[PDB]
Design a protein around this ligand. Structure first.
Ligand SMILES: [Zn+2]
Ligand SMILES: [Zn+2]
Ligand SMILES: [Zn+2]
Lengths: 585, 396, 186, 187
RNA sequence: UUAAAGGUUUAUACCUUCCCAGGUAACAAACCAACCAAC
């Protein structure tokens, strides 16, 4: 028993081959079986022929008799077909409205999540269909993770280097930090976890969360978890007020916090607020600023990853009372300076998949660009708050979509919050960028920020760009441009002060080669978000859509605080780059 | 051959009036098969006979209770009613009497089995239902004796043991009487020949066995069901010490059962227009129906109300899913309408009204929500007294 | 059984036979109007029989299934229904000794062991703050479970002892607050 | 029932019937016409009532032998289970301390109740109270069945470990007290 | 009011018997499932 996903009509008929088993009203279920390949009908019992040794599972061939369901070959004389008169017999048959068009639901429930069109339908459909699309996309990702083979430690060549034998007949997952494995210790009759691990080409260089002395026998698989049903929408209904509702602003605020006071009042004027924060603008400065601005308000800080919420705790520890703050951790080393698992504390810090069921005066979403409609819906089902604050940036990276192969996911399709602010504009905006010099700011303001991003620093004259195709080589799951690295090596010899820089690239293999050749610390652009360095060296290494991602490139070259060197393969972004150009040595 | 087996010790979960954790015996399958291939045919005849002393298999509906009570009143001179119950029948019964019951049950194989076959069947029975090895909570223990409730022939063996105890009580009552004071020549000669046949003869005398059986049937009429018994006896002979009284039962139990019985288990009735005080936990009341006075059994109303209020599974807590549960209870509680006490009839009337309310509630969840009507007309008789009155009328 | 086409056939036959009987036409001709008439009930009182059995299959199929949607749903929500029923009956009982501890436990005061019935045994209670300490304990007495219990010991959450006169409001924060209190029934 | 031969005869008789009825020759001619179809409706009767009642028995036969096959597979499963259970419980027999005591029997028959008494290598005592613990299982080593046993493990009713130092007189009321003490036969 | 009986097949009508179909009701026997009571 449930509610029809297209009608909200009470129903018990679930599409049997449809992975999330959604409740479909008799008319809706009839259309879903007659217009797709879904032929299994699940009700309280299945509408499967209960005759011995029968495989008939299509409802349009089934007849109800006596007290059961039979195929035409096995049916008794007296019956009426389960599929007749434009509806399927079942619970709540009379109370049924139906839908004029079933195309969107069919497209979402039949898609393999490999096309950008699937995501555009998922993020542009109705709220209930949005929820179903989120459920089926996460379930499809979870099952696809199981499609990868088992990697077992055959030989431990040294520390930080292993030798892995892979399962036959199954694909090997790409070796990058986006694929987090888990070890398993061989026992008498079962297996036990030995931690979470990441892998990279060497042999294979492994980086586990907890150091161990693993030997021959340990194996790694990508951990999967049960996909929970959704009930709450991705966004609560918008409400606009004439006064600040449920909050009391402080009468004494510091000049560190005065710039956002007007934005702190707008947070009180609406049910939910969308906030865009450029690199180095003080997104943590703002969100923790709402805490002191409303001292009596109970605020829950939530984020998708452990890293961001800990960074919020780090900035909270700098400005907020340690006794009133709490860090919720499920039963990964994270923030451990607040009291652990204290739901009823005034200031609660936790991630999406571990938030408890509670209420608060304000709930703070950080890093909303990596958030999906699933994470949006889950927390709203967990937290009921008077005010809702979404902080993130469309011009920054999204959560990776492994199944996506065709097309590029525009920011206005990452999630519901990203869709509004990319269309109706952000509710507030901080126009001051404090980290990068003006030249990076002016380049990234025109590219993605509508020229709305202002710089706080002046021009640094250490932002340097070079156009160099080089030679691109490909390994199993990444790309390498050794001549691009060689140019950087020649640059370092003539500019020894640039050896304090951090090497960044959109490919892990490029970082692996550059680390041994240059010796600089290496970071992928996806992992570099939320960090900062004085100098960085960026190599595009390709001209692919992965490297030319205007959200990624915004993230890539903006991790430098003083100076930057960009070896570019794409002419379009090179021309957009307002840096001082060089000639190839 | 001999096949020792293991019988598991399960723990029951049911409604009761005293806090004892009653347990039952999960006997194995081989013993079940081999004991069936004997006592299926032995006992299906017992369960299908009407008018005998053992009333196993006789229903109380459609006038069965009246027929049984009138049969047990079969021509007694100065009738009184008496009843008793053994304190611990299963856990204190000696092995000798169980062996005796098994032997009298196997007496029916005079043709199909030779002596060796009978002995080995008896050995198998003694090995797996008398002194078997019981598994109580994951450990094996040796059973001292008694009887295992959960085998094929528990009730019939209990009936045999009950009849044996009654006959022993009668014999002890007759042989212990003075004898010089007995004023009836026939009874004095009966006593003399009873002593001769007990302690002066090594072989069975069928003539005196028939004579004494006729005497017992004439003056001491029994009705036996497992360990329950109701007896109609000549009061004058019992007062004179010529048939077994209740103290004769107590002495026999004391010296042949290692058990002392008290008045909490036994009762007497001097007016037989009221029926037995208790038999199978049913009270008997003489009512009038259709120009005839009949006997109807009614239960303790507390039992019916407790069965209504407390349930085994949580699904039974919702009335609409289990309505036949209340129909059966109303069938069992109908005879309370005739009781002089008003609350007893109020129980049955309350049950009928609750059944009506349950039917209306079931109809409402349907019509309102998923628009369908299933009231029918065969349901309307479930809250009328005719359907239940027909259960106690002798026409089937 | 009115919305069927062979109903229209039966109606035509009935009209024809009514005309034949009201007219008194012939002997064999009206036999023809009763030949194709009594058969019209052989494809009516039949096709309106299987379908009429089908309908009662329906109403009662829709029934063996609402009560399973119901049976399998009811045994999946026991843990909240039982608790709500418990507290509804407990509130309906309206006993002072039960209500006192109900309110004490809803705000601050939970005992650490079964409340003893004898006049000797020990009782250990948890006091979370001073506000409850005012309501319950007054001096060397302790009113709880509608009974009087003399305190023999009060120790803070850090397992350090505390005396029965320091406790006040000026050492408000100079006391750890999850005080535990030991008492004996009077 | 359409691929039956009598359908063709019924159809051709009916076709001639409708053709001559539209023609409408006479009763003297249509008598044979309306008798041939009246016997063709009787033929298709027979053979169609000789067929649709065999589809029931064939279906019943298929179901019955389905059921018998299922039973015959379950029998093999239970046979394998019983045999493997016997063979795995035989391997704990301690086939050296049992052979010696068996060989000393005059006939080879020994009572069952003395087999675990003189051969088993583990003893598990169950203790209801401390006073019974004092007289039976006192200390780290005790004696029973004319043998000496040494304690290795003690658990309470909750199957949690208890050290031998916790079993005192005054500390007894703080223990679940069907204590299970397991020990090995020492030599 | 129209000699008699007998003869044949065919058409019509009635009655009777058998057989083959279709529906209604009853009775019983089996099987399956849920529930209640007693020792
Ligand atoms: Zn589907
Ligand atoms: Zn619908
Ligand atoms: Zn089938």
């Amino acid at each position: 028993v449930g509610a029809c996903v297209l009608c909200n009509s009470q129903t018990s008929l679930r599409c049997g081959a449809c992975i999330r088993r959604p409740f479909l009203c008799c008319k809706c279920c009839y259309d879903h079986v007659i217009s797709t390949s879904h032929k299994l009908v699940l009700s309280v019992n299945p509408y499967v022929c209960n005759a011995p040794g029968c495989d008939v599972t299509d409802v349009t061939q089934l007849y109800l008799g006596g007290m059961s369901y039979y195929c035409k070959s096995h049916k008794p004389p007296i019956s009426f077909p389960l599929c007749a008169n434009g509806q399927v017999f079942g619970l709540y048959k009379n109370t049924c409205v139906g839908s004029d068009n079933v195309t969107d639901f069919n497209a979402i429930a039949t898609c393999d999540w490999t096309n950008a069109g699937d995501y555009i339908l998922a993020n542009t459909c109705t709220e209930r269909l949005k929820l179903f699309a989120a459920e089926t996309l996460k379930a499809t990702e979870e099952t696809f993770k199981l499609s990868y083979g088992i990697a077992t430690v055959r030989e431990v060549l040294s520390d930080r280097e292993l030798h892995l034998s892979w399962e036959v007949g199954k694909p090997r997952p790409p070796l990058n930090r986006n694929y987090v494995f888990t070890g398993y210790r061989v026992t008498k009759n079962s297996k036990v976890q030995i931690g979470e691990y990441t892998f990279e080409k060497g042999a294979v260089v492994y980086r586990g969360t907890t150091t161990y002395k693993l030997n021959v026998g340990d194996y790694f698989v990508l951990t999967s978890h049960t996909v929970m049903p959704l009930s709450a929408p991705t966004l609560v209904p918008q409400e606009h007020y004439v006064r600040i509702t449920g909050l009391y602003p402080t009468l004494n605020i510091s000049d560190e916090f005065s710039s956002n006071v007007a934005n702190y009042q707008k947070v009180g004027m609406q049910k939910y607020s969308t906030l865009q924060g450029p690199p180095g603008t003080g997104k943590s400065h703002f969100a923790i600023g709402l805490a002191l601005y409303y001292p009596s308000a109970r605020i829950v800080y939530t984020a998708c990853s452990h890293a961001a919420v800990d960074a919020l705790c780090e900035k909270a520890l700098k400005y907020l009372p340690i006794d009133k703050c709490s860090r919720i951790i499920p039963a990964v080393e994270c923030f451990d300076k607040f009291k652990v698992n204290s739901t009823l504390e005034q200031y609660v810090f936790c991630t999406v998949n571990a938030l408890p069921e509670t209420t608060a005066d304000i709930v703070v979403f950080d890093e909303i660009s990596m958030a999906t409609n699933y994470d949006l819906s889950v927390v709203n089902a967990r937290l009921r708050a008077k005010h809702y604050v979404y902080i993130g940036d469309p011009a920054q990276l999204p959560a990776p979509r492994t199944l996506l192969t065709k097309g590029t996911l525009e920011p206005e399709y990452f999630n519901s919050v990203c869709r509004l602010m990319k269309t109706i504009g952000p509710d507030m905006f901080l126009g001051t960028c404090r980290r990068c010099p003006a030249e990076i700011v002016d380049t990234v303001s025109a590219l993605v920020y509508d020229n709305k991003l202002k710089a706080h620093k002046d021009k640094s004259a250490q932002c340097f760009k070079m156009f160099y195709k080089g030679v691109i080589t490909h390994d199993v799951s990444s790309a390498i441009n050794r001549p691009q690295i060689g140019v950087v090596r020649e640059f370092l010899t003539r500019n020894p002060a640039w050896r304090k820089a951090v090497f960044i690239s959109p490919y892990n293999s490029q970082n692996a080669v550059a680390s041994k050749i240059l010796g600089l610390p290496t970071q992928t652009v996806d992992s570099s978000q939320g960090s900062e360095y004085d100098y960085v060296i960026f190599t595009q290494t390709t001209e692919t859509a992965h490297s030319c991602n205007v959200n990624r490139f915004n993230v890539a070259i903006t991790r430098a605080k003083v100076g930057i060197l960009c070896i570019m393969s794409d002419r379009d972004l090179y021309d957009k780059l307002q840096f001082t150009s060089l000639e190839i040595p | 051959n001999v096949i020792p087996t293991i019988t598991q010790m399960n723990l029951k979960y049911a409604i009761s009036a005293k806090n004892r954790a009653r347990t039952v015996a999960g006997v194995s399958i081989c013993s079940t098969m081999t004991n069936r291939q004997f006592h299926q045919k032995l006992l299906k005849s017992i369960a299908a006979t009407r008018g005998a002393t053992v009333v196993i298999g006789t229903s109380k509906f459609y006038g069965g209770w009246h027929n049984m009570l009138k049969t047990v009143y079969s021509d007694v001179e100065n009738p009184h009613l008496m009843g008793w119950d053994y304190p611990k029948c299963d856990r204190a019964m000696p092995n000798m009497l169980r062996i005796m019951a098994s032997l009298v049950l196997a007496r029916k194989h005079t043709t199909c089995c030779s002596l060796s076959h009978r002995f080995y069947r008896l050995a198998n029975e003694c090995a797996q239902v008398l002194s078997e090895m019981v598994m109580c909570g994951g450990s094996l223990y040796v059973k001292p004796g008694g009887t295992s409730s959960g085998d094929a022939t528990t009730a019939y063996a209990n009936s045999v043991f009950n009849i044996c105890q009654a006959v022993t009580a009668n014999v002890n009552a007759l042989l212990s009487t003075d004898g010089n004071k007995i004023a009836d020549k026939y009874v004095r000669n009966l006593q003399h020949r009873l002593y001769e046949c007990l302690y002066r003869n090594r072989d069975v005398d069928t003539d005196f066995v028939n004579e004494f059986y006729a005497y017992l049937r004439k003056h001491f009429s029994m009705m036996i069901l497992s360990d329950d018994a109701v007896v109609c006896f000549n009061s004058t002979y019992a007062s004179q010490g010529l048939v077994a009284s209740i103290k004769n039962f107590k002495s026999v139990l004391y010296y042949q059962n290692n058990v002392f019985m008290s008045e909490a288990k036994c009762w007497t009735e001097t007016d037989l227009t009221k029926g037995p005080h208790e038999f199978c936990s049913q009270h008997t009341m003489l009512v009038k129906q259709g120009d005839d006075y009949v006997y109807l059994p009614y239960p303790d109303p507390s039992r019916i109300l407790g069965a209504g209020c407390f349930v085994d599974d949580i699904v039974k807590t919702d009335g609409t899913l289990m309505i036949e549960r209340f129909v059966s209870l109303a069938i069992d509680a109908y005879p309370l309408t005739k009781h002089p006490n008003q609350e007893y009839a109020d129980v049955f009337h309350l049950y009928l009204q609750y059944i009506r309310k349950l039917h209306d509630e079931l109809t409402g969840h349907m019509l309102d929500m998923y628009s369908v009507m299933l009231t029918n007309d065969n349901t309307s008789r479930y809250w009328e007294p005719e359907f239940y009155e027909a259960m106690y009328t002798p026409h089937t | 059984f009115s919305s069927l086409p062979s109903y229209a056939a039966f109606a035509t036959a009935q009209e024809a036979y009514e005309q034949a009987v009201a007219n008194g036409d012939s002997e064999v001709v009206l036999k023809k109007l009763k030949k194709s008439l009594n058969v019209a009930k052989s494809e009516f009182d039949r096709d309106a029989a299987m379908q009429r059995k089908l309908e009662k299959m329906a109403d009662q199929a829709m029934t063996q299934m609402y009560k399973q949607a119901r049976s399998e749903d009811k045994r999946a929500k026991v843990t909240s229904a039982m608790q709500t029923m418990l507290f509804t009956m407990l509130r309906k009982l309206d006993n002072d000794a039960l209500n006192n501890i109900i309110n004490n436990a809803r705000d601050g005061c939970v005992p650490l062991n079964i409340i003893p019935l004898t006049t000797a045994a020990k009782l250990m209670v948890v006091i979370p703050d001073y506000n409850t300490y005012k309501n319950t304990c007054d001096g060397t007495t302790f009113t709880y479970a509608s009974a009087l219990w003399e305190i023999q010991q009060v120790v803070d959450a850090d397992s350090k002892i505390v005396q029965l006169s320091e406790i006040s409001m000026d050492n408000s924060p100079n006391l750890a607050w999850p005080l535990i209190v030991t008492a004996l029934r009077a």
